């Protein structure tokens, strides 16, 4: 599962139908001036996929609608065509089309040209391992430097959500209520068994016997899950920590970084100079250093709950050439197991990229076109 193609119309600066040439399954990079349409493209994808855009009041819908001089637009849609070669999407098609259509009085999803609720859509996406939980499939510069400057309290909240305790509790409450719904049906088959063609009795009583052993296994399962729910936060901490230290050491060769608990919050201690007990707290790092470390932590968390594709909107803005090359080298490594769509103003990520796209704002609308490695590099310098 990856993004094979995107179609946009009437959506912010993409006023006119915009059919983006099919993406590489590896690393796509997008370049263009301030104001050209890059974040608008990423917002178009988030409009379809992100849980936070799933509900919009009229005031937010019309901000999505293109506005400008000339032809006035009244409706917008984004369509994503997913390649489904790995069969992660529970639909027997090589290509799966998901479209959201927005107007002032309309808001509808179409799965393979047929209407589906918002609940269908988020269930479909979780089926394929793309959660409404882990919201790190898409990263923005504003997300990075917001994480750069966040307190220890924020990082513990972050850790709780990647642990998954909240959704586990919702699934359990859902499960239990559905359990109660079967206990009433199980009563109207066990009490209903009084009456009992002699073989079908034994074959049905076999199946009653099966529901009785499964009830017991379900009760056992609920015990082991309830006991590990209280180990989750500490276990994910342990896991993200190890990931975080390995990621930072790949980014900063001789460096060292760890997470520390306190439970009140999650702190970071880091040494760029080389494990020499030069462990600085996060808040005393430099601006660029905080942003690299924020990125390493994101990479560590993505590793705890991986996604089939990643959207990165300007992640190397605060980074110097050395650290940009390190981010690029990492991206090239990750891009063999997951799709990447990124935007940058510097050449280092270009070396890491299999396909290049240029974004231009012309004649009141954004345009996105396939370009060559040379043109991307030429634009960037």
């Amino acid at each position: 599962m990856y993004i094979k193609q995107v179609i946009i119309q009437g959506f912010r600066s993409y006023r006119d139908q915009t059919i983006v040439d099919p993406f590489s399954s590896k690393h796509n990079v997008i370049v263009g001036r301030n104001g050209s349409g890059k974040s608008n493209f990423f917002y178009a994808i988030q409009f379809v996929l992100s849980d936070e855009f799933s509900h919009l009041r009229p005031e937010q819908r019309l901000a999505l609608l293109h506005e400008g001089t000339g032809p006035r637009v009244i409706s917008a849609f984004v369509e994503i065509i997913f390649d489904n070669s790995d069969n992660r999407l529970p639909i027997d098609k090589e290509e799966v089309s998901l479209r959201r259509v927005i107007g002032a009085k309309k808001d509808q999803y179409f799965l393979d040209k047929k209407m589906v609720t918002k609940n269908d859509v988020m269930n479909l996406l979780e089926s394929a391992g793309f959660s409404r939980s882990n919201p790190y499939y898409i990263v923005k510069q504003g997300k990075i430097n917001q994480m750069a400057t966040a307190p220890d309290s924020q990082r513990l909240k972050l850790l709780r959500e990647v642990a998954g305790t909240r959704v586990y509790d919702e699934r359990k409450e859902e499960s239990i209520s559905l359990m109660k719904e079967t206990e009433g049906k199980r009563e109207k088959i066990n009490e209903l068994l009084k009456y009992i063609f002699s073989e079908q009795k034994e074959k049905l009583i076999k199946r009653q016997e099966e529901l009785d052993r499964g009830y017991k296994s379900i009760m056992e399962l609920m015990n082991v899950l309830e006991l590990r729910k209280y180990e989750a936060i500490q276990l994910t901490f342990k896991q993200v920590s190890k990931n975080f230290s390995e990621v930072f050491q790949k980014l900063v060769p001789g460096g060292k970084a760890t997470l520390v608990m306190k439970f009140t919050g999650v702190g970071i201690r880091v040494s760029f100079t080389g494990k020499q007990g030069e462990m600085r707290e996060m808040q005393q790092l430099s601006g660029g250093q905080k942003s690299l470390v924020a990125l390493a932590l994101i990479f560590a968390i993505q590793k705890c709950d991986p996604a089939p594709f990643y959207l990165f909107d300007q992640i190397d803005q605060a980074l110097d050439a050395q650290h940009r090359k390190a981010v690029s080298d990492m991206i090239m490594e990750l891009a063999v197991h997951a799709q990447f769509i990124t935007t940058t103003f510097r050449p280092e990520l270009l070396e890491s990229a299999d396909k290049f796209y240029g974004v231009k704002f012309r004649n009141k609308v954004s345009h996105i076109d396939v370009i060559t490695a040379e043109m991307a590099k030429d634009f960037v310098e």
């Binding site: 269930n123 559905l178 899950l225 590990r228």
Partner: protein
């Protein structure tokens, strides 16, 4: 594997017919969630739990049908 069918019953119970509901052994399904394989985060475990209870629920309802039609035939 069987965890995959459980995963499908959690999120996309549509593409799941009687044949999976009858073939499925809850006791072993549950056992593969409790015991190793690739260890799961709490979030996935919660989905698989709902899938197991989903199939348990279907198995119970299907038995309800084959009963309310064999007690109306004998």
């Amino acid at each position: 594997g069987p965890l995959a069918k459980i995963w499908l019953a959690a999120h996309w119970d549509k593409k799941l017919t009687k044949a999976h509901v009858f073939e499925c052994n809850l006791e072993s399904s549950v056992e593969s969630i409790i015991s190793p394989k690739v260890k799961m985060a709490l979030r996935t475990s919660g989905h698989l739990l709902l899938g197991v209870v989903r199939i348990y629920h279907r198995k119970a309802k299907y038995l309800l049908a084959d009963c309310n039609e064999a007690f109306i035939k004998i």
